[PDB]
Every structure is written in structure tokens, then in C-alpha cells.
Design a binder for this molecule. Sequence first.
Ligand SMILES: Cn1cnnc1Sc1ccccc1NS(=O)(=O)c1cccc(Cl)c1O
Length: 358
Amino acid sequence: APQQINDIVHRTITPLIEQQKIPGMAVAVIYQGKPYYFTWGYADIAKKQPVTQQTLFELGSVSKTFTGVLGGDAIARGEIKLSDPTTKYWPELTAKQWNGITLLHLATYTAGGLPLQVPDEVKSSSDLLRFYQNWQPAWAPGTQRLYANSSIGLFGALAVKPSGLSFEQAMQTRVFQPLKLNHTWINVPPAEEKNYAWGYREGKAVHVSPGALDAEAYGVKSTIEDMARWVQSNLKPLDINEKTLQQGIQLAQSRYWQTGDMYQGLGWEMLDWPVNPDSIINGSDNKIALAARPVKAITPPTPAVRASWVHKTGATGGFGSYVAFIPEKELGIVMLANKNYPNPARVDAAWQILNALQ
Ligand SMILES: Cn1cnnc1Sc1ccccc1NS(=O)(=O)c1cccc(Cl)c1O
């Protein structure tokens, strides 16, 4: 690790860990295409297990970038189209409010007010059908963005239906395996449980619990090394040998909607680089990121812009993650922590690091 990288990373992350009381953290910087790794603290405070480059963290909503790319791969395979009605893949969805709601709307949170969470009362699949049938939009499709697991989660589930594969099976065979993400899991296998960090919420060790559409919206667990490889793959999609996957990655970074200075991709969110750091820092506060905001359609979508800050924040009850990269600079960062700490602290740290290296 070049001393410049070592210095900027430690000078930024050390105070962050102290200020936020983060039990364990892993960081990867991608600089001129090569990864550099940093670890601090504890994956398991009780058993005194350190964070290592093999520790698994819950990605929370960074999982949506995998769902977005898997959907993009399905488009590239010709199995689905973003301009297809939701009811083409779920014929049982007969309620008339679904007329005009497309897979694009589901993938980009623009269906008209689908809620942030699937109600915990929904367990069975007939519960899920009932929930979506009875849901009443607040807005017409394609007019307002409201960040929602019930939106992109349904997209992920529907996008794999023509393949006949389960969501987890599709993700493993079409995304994880081709990219050699061999320590990235929807369900952590017994063989890897020793590497699975505990999350910490108010001092209690916690793991994410099962829920409806959890795999599609917030269910991936990964190591810092696999996540660095995920960033490298999205920084340089053309190096990828599987044709539909290379195409799907590009599709997930296309710009479909604009609100303020942010653009909505499939999972990924993008801003023009150079960014105003106060825009992404304040913009990452959940108060703005989770608010209902009017969108302007980008007709047709802009293909992946190299001069972009591309990023996604993620959280679970016990974890906080952040990924960001700049394709034009060959530059990227991954931050994984086993405490959910405020988003603006994440983006501030990441911008301080990448700004110093560009
Ligand atoms: C649903 N559920 C049940 N058990 N665990 C979960 S996930 C979870 C739990 C607690 C906080 C955040 C999440 N993740 S989230 O809903 O996707 C999300 C919302 C808003 C912002 C982000 Cl950055 C984000 O990740």
C-alpha cells in the first residue's frame, strides 16, 4: 500500500471509528485498478474475533446493486424488458391500479408510492399477492420516487421468473460465480459461519432476520475482498467475459430518472463528477434519501456516464455499508462496518479519501 493511501485512509477512518463507536470495520480502496485493504476492531466482541479480509458483513441495501445488475443481465438475455407491464410476469396481479406500472417503475422506486418495507404481517406468498393487490398508489407511475424494498424487491423476484431459477440460484450462477465472488452469499453456509461478523445495535449482537423479499432487497453478505472485486467489475464492465453480464452492469448504471442532482440507476445511484460534496453528504441522510421526491424522466435513459460518482449506502439493524466509485478515475471505495451509523458520516469519509487520491 502506497504511503499516500495508507495515510489518507487511516487519518479518515480512525477518528470515524472513535466518533461513531464502531466495533469493527473493513475498508478497500481501488486505486488505478488495484485493491488495498484495511481492517480494524472486532467481528465478534464476545469471542474476541478480529475483523479480517475474510469477515462477512451484512450489506443491507448495497444488495440492491446486485439485484439491479442481475435484472440487467436478464434484460441482456432477452428474458425480460423494462418496458413490460408488471402483470406480464405476475398474471395474478389483476387489480386495475397495476395498469401502466412497468418493471422499470418497480426497479427505480417510481411505481407510485410502494412502501419502504413489506409489512411484517406478510409471510406466505399468498400474503404477498394480497398485499400488492390491495396496495393503492398515491401517485401516477413514473412521477414520484419513494425508496422502497417492496418495489425493487418485487422487481428482483419477477426478473428471474422466465429463467425458472430461484432468485438465489440465479444470483449465484449469473452474477456471483462469473465474477468469482466466492465468499458472497444470500444465505451464509455453515462452512462460512466462523467468518460471519455479528452486528451491533445498542450493544446487542444481532443478525438480520428472515423477511419477505429479503434476498432481493437487503439480503447479501460479503467480504471486503469480494466487495472490492464487485467495485472493480462495475468500474470496468468491459473486462468481463460473460456478454450478458457485462451488458447488465452497463444497464444498471444507465440514468433513468433525475431528482435534484442525483440520477437513478438499477440499484446504483449516480451523480455527475466532480460532485458538490455537501450534496452527496447531506443527500445521503435518510431524511432526504427516503423522502418522496418528484422525478424527471430521462427519455431515453443515458448510458453509463464515465464521469460519475456512482454509489449506494446500505444498512441493517446491526450493520452499515457504503460503496462508491468513479469510472473515469479508476477510483473506488468500500466501507463495511458492524454498526449502523449515520449515512452522512460514511459519505464524508469516502469523499475525503477519494478526493485526496484523484
Ligand atoms: C427489513 N429488515 C428486517 N430485518 N432487517 C431488515 S433490513 C434493515 C433493517 C434496519 C435498517 C435498515 C435496513 N435495510 S433497508 O430496509 O434495506 C434500508 C432502509 C433505508 C436506508 C438504508 Cl441505507 C437501508 O439499507
